[PDB]
Amino acid sequence: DVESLPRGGFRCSLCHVTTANRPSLDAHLGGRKHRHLVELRAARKAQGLRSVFVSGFPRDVDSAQLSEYFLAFGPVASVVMDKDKGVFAIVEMGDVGAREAVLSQSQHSLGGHRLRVRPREQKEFQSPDSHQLAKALAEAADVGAQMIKLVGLRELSEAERQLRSLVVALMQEVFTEFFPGCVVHPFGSSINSFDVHGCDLALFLDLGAAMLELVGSILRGCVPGVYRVQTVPSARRPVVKFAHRPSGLHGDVSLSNRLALHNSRFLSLASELDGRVRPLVYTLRAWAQGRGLSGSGPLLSNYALTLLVIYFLQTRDPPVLPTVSQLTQKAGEGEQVEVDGWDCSFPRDASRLEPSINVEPLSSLLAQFFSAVSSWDLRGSLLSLREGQALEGLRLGPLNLQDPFDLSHNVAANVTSRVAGRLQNCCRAAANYARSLQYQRRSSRGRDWGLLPLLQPSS
RNA sequence: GGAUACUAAAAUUGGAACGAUACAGAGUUCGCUCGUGAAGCGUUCCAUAUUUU
Ligand SMILES: [Zn+2]
């Protein structure tokens, strides 16, 4: 599990850990993380050593008969049904000494048809951009054309959207089998029209930790092709993270996050107001993801980026987007939605309101956003999208930002002091670069013109 | 007949402690020598948190 690397280095593939010397590698091998990885790998290896693969039995029969039959050959640990095909099964025996008892006789039968039992071959244990981006943008007309082309490139293709729809339909079918009358609402980066390649799909279940564990068990056992299922109650809204293998996707399933559905609807409505907010949001999201400020864990999530863009568009002297106060005022009949204490309403249609009085191009908006976000205070200034100004929060530090619909979650509470300072410095750098003349106009035969330096693979 | 399941301590950040690596500085008998750091790391400990939109 150790591979040699130059400079006298080593790499543990069991933990994916690179060490520059020998004592560090030895200390890592002496730690509890590597020991636990070894123990879990050995447990999986032993289970594979005491398991068999059964196929050939006729369809429309359950694995209960298989378990009852195999119980005659000693203790049986588990029987796992096939997923996505439903044609075979994996029988994990209790004791190793009984495995050969399964291998003693191959004359198997179930419902008349004959079967086929084999030893389980042990699969090897597994431990649990910037080229095309600069390629397909630098031949556009101007920076606005660059941002429009970036939107076109980052937009999910028909294949990805249809695949996500298929996943949603499968989840709905399974959960309707388990919970009749339930609905699986897709949302996240799928219905808000701000869809990027390799985005997260969130699934709201419309009908404490027991339900979360039940959903996790459903995903682990019955739902096809889904591995990496992790329940997470330690959050404002408990969520099951799930990964899907055949699609190579990863997403989140929530039970009570009803506000996020209307949040995604509002994001889509804001995107449909005009053809400039969407390019601005896509460009700023790409810039954040290309400068080490949008990743996993304590880093600024994709939703906070769109929230900041909407707030900035609200704060302009010519109102690009009316604030959430006006949006709530624009609501009509059948639009009295309110969840979790407070009320937040907005129209569900697009052609109901007045177009904005802004005419600035995309480059001007980007430069103004960079200047404003660089100059703004980060110590104790909380941004209110509902009122569209600056000054109920729960926890905040060097970054203050709350939802305009969920007025209790400070979405900026996932950024520490150093990350906030780096963000402010990057904003100042982008602002001065936009003020500089090189960014303002085109270079034909290669200079990294326009948005490319902001989108370059920097450090 | 038709392709051999992702089972506990799932993660990162704030503070830490210890062990090493770096020398645009110099020498060497080729063993290293003098002193100074957090770049990458490893081990362990305490978490008014996040990682979903
Ligand atoms: Zn290891």
Residue numbers in the entry: 7 to 134, 145 to 223, 337 to 520, 532 to 599
Task: Show the paper's wording.
U6 snRNA is a catalytic RNA responsible for pre-mRNA splicing reactions and undergoes various post-transcriptional modifications during its maturation process. The 3'-oligouridylation of U6 snRNA by the terminal uridylyltransferase, TUT1, provides the Lsm-binding site in U6 snRNA for U4/U6 di-snRNP formation and this ensures pre-mRNA splicing. The oligouridylation of U6 snRNA depends on the internal four-adenosine tract in the 5'-part of the telestem of U6 snRNA, and hTUT1 adds uridines until the internal adenosine tract can form base-pairs with the 3'-oligouridine tract. Together, the recognition of the specific structure and sequence of U6 snRNA by the multi-domain TUT1 protein and the intrinsic sequence and structure of U6 snRNA ensure the oligouridylation of U6 snRNA.
Here, we present the crystal structure of a shortened hTUT1 complexed with a short U6 snRNA, representing the post-uridine addition to the 3'-end of U6 snRNA by hTUT1. Therefore, for a short hTUT1, we designed the hTUT1 lacking the PRR and the KA-1, hereafter termed hTUT1_ΔC. For a shorter U6 snRNA, we designed U6 snRNA lacking the 5'-short stem and the ISL and possessing four 3'-Us (U103-U106), hereafter termed U6_mini. For the crystallization, several cysteine residues in the hTUT1_ΔC were replaced with serine or alanine and one of the catalytic residues, aspartate (Asp218), was replaced with alanine. The crystal belongs to the space group P6522 and contains one hTUT1_ΔC-U6_mini complex in the asymmetric unit cell. Finally, the structure was refined to an Rwork of 30.2% (Rfree = 33.9%) at 3.7 Å resolution. The N-terminal ZF and the RRM constitute a single domain without any linker between them, and the ZF-RRM and the palm of hTUT1_ΔC together clamp the 5'-single stranded region containing the AUA motif of U6_mini. The ZF and the groove loop (amino acid residues 423–427) in the fingers hold the double-stranded telestem from the major and minor grooves of the stem region of U6_mini, respectively, and the 5'-anchor (amino acid residues 357–371) of the palm stacks with the base-pair at the top of the telestem. In the structure of the hTUT1_ΔC-U6_mini complex, the 3'-terminal uridine of U6_mini, corresponding to U106 of U6 snRNA, resides in the incoming UTP-binding site (+1 position) in the catalytic pocket, and the uridine base stacks with the uridine base of U105 (−1 position, 3'-priming position). Thus, the present structure represents the post-U-addition stage.
